[PDB]
Amino acid sequence: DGPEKNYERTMAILQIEAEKAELRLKELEVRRLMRARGDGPWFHYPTIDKELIDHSPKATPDN
Amino acid sequence: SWDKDVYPEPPRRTPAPSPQTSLPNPITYLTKAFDLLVDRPVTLVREFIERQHAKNKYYYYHREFRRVPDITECQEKDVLCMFEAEMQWRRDYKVDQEIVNIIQERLKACQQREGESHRQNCAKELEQFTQVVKAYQDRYHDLGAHYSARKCLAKQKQRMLAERKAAKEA
Numbered sequence: 001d002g003p004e005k006n007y008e009r010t011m012a013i014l015q016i017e018a019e020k021a022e023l024r025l026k027e028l029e030v031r032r033l034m035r036a037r038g039d040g041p042w043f044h045y046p047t048i049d050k051e052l053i054d055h056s057p058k059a060t061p062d063n
Numbered sequence: 064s065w066d067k068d069v070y071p072e073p074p075r076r077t078p079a080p081s082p083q084t085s086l087p088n089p090i091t092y093l094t095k096a097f098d099l100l101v102d103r104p105v106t107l108v109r110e111f112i113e114r115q116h117a118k119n120k121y122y123y124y125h126r127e128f129r130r131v132p133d134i135t136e137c138q139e140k141d142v143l144c145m146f147e148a149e150m151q152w153r154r155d156y157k158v159d160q161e162i163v164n165i166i167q168e169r170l171k172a173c174q175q176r177e178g179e180s181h182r183q184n185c186a187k188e189l190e191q192f193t194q195v196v197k198a199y200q201d202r203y204h205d206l207g208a209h210y211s212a213r214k215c216l217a218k219q220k221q222r223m224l225a226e227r228k229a230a231k232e233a
Contacts, residue, residue: 007150014142 069165073176128154134212145212152212159199166195 034040082088134148170188177184201222206214 011143011146014146018140018142 070169070172072172134216149212152215156203156210159202163195163199166192 030040031042034042038044128151131147131151132144134145134152137144137148166188170185170192173185173188174181202215202219203210206218
C-alpha cells in the first residue's frame with residue numbers, strides 16, 4: 001500500500017470508532033435521564049386519552 | 064562510503080619495515096601473490112560491474128517525517144491528535160535505539176583498535192556511551208511492553224516532580 005495510505009486510512013478508522021464510542025456513552029446518559037424524568041420520547045408510557053371525555057350537558061347539572 | 068564524523072577513526076600510523084634479517088619475509092611474497100592472483104582479477108570483475116551501473120543511474124531518498132504536535136499538546140481522549148503524537152513518539156523511540164547502537168559501536172571499535180592500551184585511550188568513547196545510556200534509560204526504561212507516549216510522559220512527570228522536590232530540599 002505505502003505508509004501514507006495506511007496512516008491516513010487509520011485516522012479515518014479511528015475517527016469513526018471514536019465517534020461511535022462517544023455516541024454509545026451519550027445514549028446511556030440520555031436513557032438514564034429520559035427514564036428518570038419521563039420528559040422525552042423514550043419511556044413514554046401511555047395515559048388515558050382526553051378525547052374520550054364527553055363534554056355534553058349531562059342528565060344532572062353538577063358535573 | 065560512510066560519514067567519518069558519525070563513525071570516526073583516528074589517523075592510521077603503520078611503521079615502515081626495518082628488516083634486521085637476511086632471510087626473505089614469506090609474507091611479502093604472499094602479499095604479491097595475493098595482489099596478482101586474488102586482488103587484480105577481483106578488481107577487474109568489479110570494474111566491469113560498475114561500468115554497467117554507470118549506464119543506468121537512478122536514485123532513492125531518505126524519508127523525511129515532518130514534526131507534529133507532541134502528546135503533551137493532545138487533549139484527553141482525542142484519538143486523532145493522539146494517533147499522530149503516538150506514531151511520532153514511536154518513530155523517535157526507534158531512532159534513539161539506533162543512536163545508542165551507534166555509540167555502542169564507536170565504543171567497541173575503540174576497544175579493539177587501541178589494543179592493550181584501551182583502558183586509557185577509550186575514555187572519551189566510554190564517557191559518551193555512559194551519558195547516552197543514561198539519557199536513554201531516563202526516557203524509556205521501565206515502561207513495559209505496552210509502552211506509549213502517555214506512559215513515557217507520566218514517567219517524565221514523576222521524575223520532574225522528584226527533581227523539583229529535591230531542589231527545594233536543597
